[PDB]
Structures are given as C-alpha cells and as structure tokens.
Structure 1
C-alpha cells in the first residue's frame, strides 16, 4: 500500500539520520559535533539522506537555526539544495523555515539569497484526501497559509510573485479558500491583494483557476461562507441610507447564469459538497432565487407539471381501452387453473372508437421520443426507463407476443411515480418527496437484505410444513416461489394468515408461525425506531434546506432549455444608467 511506504521512509530516514553523524548532529543541533565533522575531519557535507535530504534540510525540519547556520557558514551551497526524493521532489530549506514560521531563519535564508520561486512538486504536497494539509508549491503560498504575515511580506520584499500559479493553476488567493481558519484567512487574503499591480484589468481576483474558476466563484462551490461574505464587499454598491433602510445594489455578474456555465448558481447545485448548499441562502443570492421563483419559475413548473399530468393520464386511457379478444386459444388446454383472455388485435380496423385510440397511441410515442430528444435525482431515471418501455411495447406491438402485458405494465407506475417528482416545489410536500428520495435509494436497498434473510428462513420453512399438507385447502405455500410470496405478504400481515380451522393444522405450522409473527414485528418495530435519527432539530432544517436546494436546482434547469421571448434576465443592466454595463439587483433591508 501507499499509506505504509511513507511510514517506512519516515523510519528509513531516521535510520540514515541516526547512521549519518552529519545528519545526526544536524538533527540534535550539536554545534560541537558539526565542526568536528566539517572543519577538522571533512565529512560529506552534501550528505543525501534517505529522503534525498541534506544536513541543512534536517537542520530545517527542526528549528535549529544554529545547526542551519553552521551548515550554511561552512557550506553556503546547501541552501539551493532541493529535496532529491520522490516524496519531497522540490522542497528546499526555505520551505521548512516558512512553514515553521522561523522568521529569523527565513530572514537569514533570504539574506543568503534563497529562491522565492521554487516549486515543491513532491507527492506529499498534493491535494489528496489522504494528505492532511495543502498549502501549494510556492513559498509565498506557504507563508499565506500559516498566517505569518511578517513572512508573507518578507517574501514579497525579495521578489515573490503573487501571479505565480502552481500545477493546478491556483494563485495564492485560491489556496486561502481551502483553509479552516477563515476568520484569519481574510486578513491574509487582503494582505495579498495590496501587492497587486494596481490596475483594474488583469487583476489577481480575476485570474481564473485551471477549471475556469475565479477566487470569488470558488468560495461558493466549496461552501466557504466567511470568504464568500468577505469577497462580496469588493463587488457591491450601496445607494442610500434612509435611517434603518439601506438599499444596497449588488454586482450580480458571475453570480448569474450569463455564461453558458460560467455561473455560480450552476456550480452550487451540481457539486456534492454539503457545505455548498448554504451558499444560495446567502443574502446576495437568496434575494435572487426567491424572486426567480415567486414569479415565472413557479408557474412554468406548473405548466410542465400539468402537461406531464395529462400526458400520463392519456397513456393510462389507452391501456384501459385497448385491443380485445375473447381468447383464441382453444380452452384451458395447458393447466386447468388458467384465467387467460388474450386481448391482441394485430389489425388496424375498429375505426369508430379506435380512431380515437389511433391518435392516442401516436401521442404517447411522439412524447416518449420527445422525452428522449431532450436527454441525448432518482426522478431522472424514472422518466427515461418509462419512455423506454413505451418503445418496447411498440415492439411487442406489431409482433403481438403473449407477454404483451409485461412491458406495458412497467410504464404505468413509472409514469405516475415520476409525476410525484412535481411535488418537489409546488407546495410544502416537496421535503416529503425528498425524504422518500433518501428512503427508496438509501435504507430500503440495505434494509431489504435483512428482511429477505428473515423471509428466506421462514418461507422455506412454511413450504416444508405444507409440502406434506394438501394445497387445496390452505394452499398459501404451494409453489417454490409462491411459498415465499405468501410469507412476504404474511411478513406484512396483508393476508388473513394461514388460518384454516376445518383441517388439522400440522404440528409444526402452529409452532413456526408464532415464531414468525413475533420476529416479523420485532423487525418491523425496530425499523420504525430506526427512522428517528432524522427528527432532532437540524434534520428538519437539513431536508428543508435540501428541498430549497432542489428547488433552486429546478429553477436553473428551466432557464436553459426554455426560449428567451419570455423570462427576462435577473436585475437591471448597466445601460441608460451610469453603471458598468454588468445586471444589478436592488435589495433594500432594515437593521435594528
């Protein structure tokens, strides 16, 4: 494994440190042992340890400014030495001094002429979930993350480039967005803006990420609220202060679906970051999406909903009024227990009341392909397999198979179970369907593994008990599978329970079913209690916040496929008004 290789090399280093006396005296900061190894007896002052480190590299891991100076005064070429290992390919002696906030060592490494543009492209400096931190590649980025504002400026003094981007195309600003101490990263974010060129164009706040992300837009996708609140102060204008009233005018540029994507909205609903869902609830955005929904958002969702309501009640009207036949097969020639009345009409006659079905069968197929023409959570897979069964039934039609009902049946449940997708929004039943959305595709697929276990023990028992018994009277368990289906129903107490009192029940049924009734309830009562984990107070706020999440998500969906002769752009643009042509939304509020 990889998690053990670094554990071993961290120990193989200590071996070579313990083995190499130069690296040892540099670790133990033994001043009276380096000169015994560098001046009297000239040892290998360029000693590469296990991790390709030098004596100065070891003298920097542990703040040994003495051992560092001894190695820089007896061999001033060790400062320019980078780590020559795989785990630290790029790290130098200045990196460790800036990380350790060794100001007097950064001040001394810079007085020695260290490089302020050395990238630390080692594998331990990467952005991985198994790595604990991530500060970047450039030493200025490290000073920016540790908070040592004295070192941040001290690196700029010696020619540090803020425009310098790492391998991920991240400036020093983007790195400050992925840090915990947001309340102190703001003061460091502003300190890094004061060294800009001072021009309104090619600004550092406008240098986008390699994934097309400005430092302002990244704070929204990552869930960073404090930096999103701090970055908003740079892009908002206040109009007037009328006592408690303050009508502020927000910029609303990258926070708008203007670019095809190139929108903060289209990035909050699409990310899997749970913290990001709190960003559309911020005061510059919440006034947008609340006005994007109170008008022209809610009625259009009711238009597509009502259309799909009628498109589904039409498909059902074509199934209750479909071809008929009093069964052309002779009789019950196979098995006598045959309730078969095949209803297949290959012909296109019946024109009186079938010409109404002719156009009806034509609408459901042109709508099914229209459903697929606009496609080339869980409610997304229900609508696509619905129209898939429509074309397969059209294939079972014109071929008229005896299984002409199995493909036609799946389209009934999927047509309506996808019309409860419109409960998302509309009224307050939205969080109810987002609650079952976590249930159908969360616990159910895991809870059934425990119920099938209980059924496959009792169903296989009730079959052997009534295998000796005659299935004519009390034949709940007769087939191999139907013995399980009756046990499945009996696990839900839908059936009366195999209660035949005229016959003599076998001695093992009156014993096994009692054991099934208790355990079936103890798995039902323990399932009801298992749902109480989402009841304290935040979970009512989480799903209501997640309902508003999928509410704003659907709101942005309709803005892209609908035309533009309706549904205007958010706010008011900057033309015919002394503005910068960018949008703006006038939101006045009141304090206390």
Structure 2
C-alpha cells in the first residue's frame, strides 16, 4: 500500500541523494568543473551509490550529460560495467539509459570502453505490466529497436549483439516490436533486424517461438497488430500470375490454419479477450479462409445441429405437456382454501396404452442430456458462446427431473419446468449466424449479461420502497376486494408487475381506497415511466454508426468462433481441410488457398 507510492517515494528519495551527494549532484547538472574538483583533488567516493543503487555515471546518463559522463569514465573506467542494484532497476547499466535517450555519440563512445551488449534489465519497472507505461524488454538491443533509433540498432550488432537472445518472457527482439504503439515505423525496424539472421531456411528468428508458444507472426494476430500482420504476410504468400487487373495470389496457410493443435492462429483469435484481434479475421488471407469455411461445411452442419436440437427439445416438451396423472387425490384442498393444486405423482407407472411413447420420449430426452454432458465436460467465462452455458445446465435439470422422478416429490414441477425455458431459449443461439437475426441475438447477449445486472440493481430499488408502502397501505385494508398486497411477498410481486404496467393497477370503485394509496400510486407511476424512458434513452448511445458495425463485427466474429469450434470437434471423414496441398505439385509441402482479386 502501495506499489505506485513506493516508486513515487523512491523517485523523490533518489533526488534526495542527488541533492545530498555532491558527486551525484554535479553529475546531474553536468558540472565538469565540479567533478574534477571532487575526483582528482581530493579523491572522494567515486563509486558512490545513490538511493536507487545508481552510480554517478547512471545519473550522468539519465540527463544527456556527455561531458559529465566522459569525466566519470576517464577518471574511473570501471563504472561502465556497474549495473543498478535497486530492485526497481535490477540489471540496468549505463548503456541502457544512453540507448533509450538515443545518445549516439555516447553509445558509440560506450562501446569503445567495452560495454556489455547482453546485460538483462530484470528490474521490476522493466517488466511487462500495465503499471509500466512501456515495455522495451531486457536486452539493450531490444531497447534500441523500440526507440526506433536505427543508428543504434546496427551499432549494437557491430559489437556482438545477439538477435536470438530472449528475455524472461521468452520474447525475441521481434516479439517485442509487435507490442509497440508506432506500428508503421516498427515495420522498417522489423526488417532491419531480420537482415542479421543466419540466412538459412532452418532455425530462423521469425520461427523462434515465444515462451508461451507463439511465433512473431502468430503473436501479431493475437495482439491485433494489423500493420505487422499484413507485413509478416509478405514473407508467406506467392503471386501466381498477373492478368491485367486480376492477380491470383497463393497464401501460405501454414500457421494460419489448424492443426495445431492450439498452435493455430484462428483458434487464438476466437478465444482471446482482445477487442483488437477481432479485426484480424477481416484480413485478405484470412477473410477468404473463414468465408469458405462457412458457406460450405460450416453453415449446413450448424443448421443440422439446430435442426437436431429443435427436434430434440420439441420431444422433451412432448413429455412435459403429457406429464403423468393424477389429481390431488388428497383432502389437502381443505387446509388453506387458496390451494388449487391437483398434484400429479407416480407411480402409477407404467402399464402403457399410449404411455409407452412417453417412456421412449423420456429415454430420448435423458440420453441427449448425458451426450451434451459428455461433450461439454472440458478439462469457461468467454464471449463466443454465452448461450451454451445454459445447455449444460439444461442437461443438469433433466437429470434432476430424473432424480425428481423415481422419488415422486411434490416439487416435481419446479425442475421439470426449468428445463422448458432453458432448452428453447437456447435455440435462438442458432439464430447466431443464420441471417440478420444473428446480430440481434448479439444485442440480447450484450444486454442480458451487462446492462441488465447493473440496471436491475437500480430497478431493484424503488420497487421495494413502494412495495413496502403499498403493503402498509393495504395491510389495513381488507384483501378480499382488491388485495394486490395481502402479504409481503406478493406485495413485492404485485408492485413489480405494476412497474411494467401489466396489471390494471388496484382499481376498485365499489369500495373506497385509503387516502394514502391514491397519493402513493400516482408518484410510483410517474417515476416508473421516467425510470423506464431513461432506460430506453440509455439504449441510444449504443446505436451510433459504429455500434451497428461493432455488433455486426461481433456477429461474424462469433460465427467464425462457431466455425472453428465445429471443425475441432467433428471428425475428419467430413469437412476437408480448406485449401489445396502441395505434394506433386511439390510446391509445399503445406496447404494453400488460391485467391484472386481485382485492383480498380
């Protein structure tokens, strides 16, 4: 409490030691006449450590003081090898600070003194974290690549800088360039670093994987870096011919398609929470891949599953609507005359005239629940499919209904009634794709699990304020004639119904309503309308020109997400691999997709 306070304090605690130490003060202010007055006559603490474990050279490198830095290296040339010792800066040398500041005349003078070109900077402030406004890696070659100083990147390779060197997160200098803001300038820097590769077709830096199993080409897709994704595609696409305006290009489709297994660029985009990566399946090598994946194979099998699931649910309801006998067969209708229960229990089973059709019906319904369960027990909380967490709980309710059966509980209706709504309402998950009702279900997915829960807690109040009042108002009145609030639980249910203007509202003209109801309900009506108009106006805002493109981009996104998931579960005798393979014609040996386009 807190980490931000510590660095805020230690930045202030550093300036304290700078101001206190006359050596570090002159190194900060570039006082050449004061450094020699401290190092030569008399001899002071030349290896003086500051608050952050810094040296006088580390301070002289933070503020571009070349004159004050040459003084410290001509009087004591061992300060160059010294790294920062504090935890915030563990591993940083004076070369890192000069590279970050793009001090060319200092880096070219630091490498003449013999500085290390492989000094990791494992400090807590050099880590890949949101609280760090940057992430340039750990090696000084990566720092030169991130600042964009091409004069320093090649000047480091001149003195044995290794481009293959990875950091603590297994990232090469190519992986770090992908996570940078200046995308258009990093492409030129990405090519500058590729030229120093070994040059052989095997063991290439573009193939050196991240420690999370992610080549630089594959990392660009997950990160949503379109400028780098398009640039990394030039290395892996072959133009077949140029027939005037037409140009049929052949795409590599190696690391773009599965499998794999999870080492597939498509599976990484459909499973990530990055809102930027959703634009990658709209790129011209991939958009042709998934569009052909859905026109054939994709759309039919999804409709078959829906046609199967439509007939599967309509069979389950056929068992419910034809639920077993019988009437209440009990004098239970005498206690609490408000009871109209004719509870149907078992058994009373089977001895089947037309009842054996319901036996095979209950059998078909229960074998589908375990089939769903068997295919949905995966060894969670994701966008691309928020409806089929309900399909695994539907199979849970069927089993409970099966356990509610064979026990014959008076609560036989509650579990058998829950599966009716979850089963059907899950069929509009098949509206996804299909047609233009797909993005409409995207609207319902975005509201049910976001704008609802927040606005409910707003609408959860007010009601119980007026419901508690209406209870007190009509706790005094006789609930026989006009008793919308006879007890407290129904007082809230009747008030909730009245918030949505369903019931006519308590209206009785034979009797006289209490003096407080006619006053309390008028206010509840005006607030319930204003609270509902503001709910409709709050819908606006997610109606601009971009949100119609957003949900349409989200629709086709979750359609591609459904397409990739079907291919990774269905067998291989159906659904062939998209593209053509290169085996005599031996121009592979991988699978290629041929796409021609016309430049206007």
Higher mean C-alpha displacement, 87-96 vs 560-569? 560-569
2:475 aligns to what SS in structure 1? Answer: coil
Cα shift readout 1:329-369 (whole Å, capped 9, x = no counterpart)? 12523211110101112243231111111111111111000
Any conservation in 1 of the 2:325–2:348 contact (CA below 8 Å)?
no
Quick one: distance in 2 between partners of 1:477 and 1:438?
35
Quick one: distance in 2 between partners of 1:260 and 1:46?
54
Cα shift readout 1:437-465 (whole Å, capped 9, x = no counterpart)? 01000111111111111101111111111
Higher mean C-alpha displacement, 341-350 vs 471-480? 341-350
Cα shift readout 1:518-559 (whole Å, capped 9, x = no counterpart)? 000010111000000111111000000000000000000110
1:85 aligns to what SS in structure 2? Answer: coil
1:70 aligns to what SS in structure 2? Answer: helix
Any conservation in 2 of the 1:241–1:247 contact (CA below 8 Å)?
yes
1:339 aligns to what SS in structure 2? Answer: coil
Cα shift readout 1:309-343 (whole Å, capped 9, x = no counterpart)? 01100110001112111212125232111101011
Which of the numbers 454, 464, 482 marks the counterpart of 2:462?
454
The alpha carbon displacement at 1:15 in A equals 0.4
- Give the paired residue count: 591
The alpha carbon displacement at 1:421 in A equals 0.5
Higher mean C-alpha displacement, 508-517 vs 321-330? 321-330
Cα shift readout 1:92-130 (whole Å, capped 9, x = no counterpart)? 000000000000000000000000000000000000011
Higher mean C-alpha displacement, 348-357 vs 433-442? 348-357
Cα shift readout 1:13-60 (whole Å, capped 9, x = no counterpart)? 000011100011101110010111100011100001000000000000
Quick one: distance in 2 between partners of 1:94 and 1:517?
72
The alpha carbon displacement at 1:80 in A equals 0.2
Quick one: distance in 2 between partners of 1:64 and 1:167?
31
1:380 aligns to what SS in structure 2? Answer: coil
The alpha carbon displacement at 1:560 in A equals 1.1
The alpha carbon displacement at 1:378 in A equals 2.1
Quick one: distance in 2 between partners of 1:537 and 1:177?
30
Any conservation in 2 of the 1:88–1:120 contact (CA below 8 Å)?
yes
Q: TM-score, normalised by structure 1?
A: 0.99
The alpha carbon displacement at 1:398 in A equals 0.6
Higher mean C-alpha displacement, 69-78 vs 578-587? 578-587
The alpha carbon displacement at 1:91 in A equals 0.1
Any conservation in 2 of the 1:27–1:59 contact (CA below 8 Å)?
yes
Any conservation in 2 of the 1:144–1:152 contact (CA below 8 Å)?
yes
Any conservation in 1 of the 2:248–2:595 contact (CA below 8 Å)?
yes
Any conservation in 1 of the 2:102–2:152 contact (CA below 8 Å)?
yes
Q: TM-score, normalised by structure 2?
A: 0.98
Quick one: distance in 1 between partners of 2:138 and 2:330?
79
Quick one: distance in 1 between partners of 2:325 and 2:102?
86
Quick one: distance in 1 between partners of 2:360 and 2:201?
63
Any conservation in 2 of the 1:382–1:417 contact (CA below 8 Å)?
no
Cα shift readout 1:214-255 (whole Å, capped 9, x = no counterpart)? 000000000000000100001000000000000000000000
Quick one: distance in 2 between partners of 1:421 and 1:20?
69
Quick one: distance in 2 between partners of 1:68 and 1:153?
23
Quick one: distance in 2 between partners of 1:254 and 1:112?
44
The alpha carbon displacement at 1:385 in A equals 1.0
Equivalent in the alignment of 1:139? 140
Structure 1: 4+ residue segments shifted above 6 A: none
The alpha carbon displacement at 1:131 in A equals 0.6
Equivalent in the alignment of 1:97? 98
Equivalent in the alignment of 1:423? 431
Equivalent in the alignment of 1:388? 396
Any conservation in 1 of the 2:58–2:93 contact (CA below 8 Å)?
yes
The alpha carbon displacement at 1:380 in A equals 2.4
Task: Give the gaps of 5 or more residues in structure 2.
Answer: 377-384
The alpha carbon displacement at 1:561 in A equals 1.1
Quick one: distance in 1 between partners of 2:500 and 2:517?
18
Root-mean-square deviation over aligned CA pairs: 0.7
Equivalent in the alignment of 1:342? 343
Task: Give the gaps of 5 or more residues in structure 1.
Answer: none
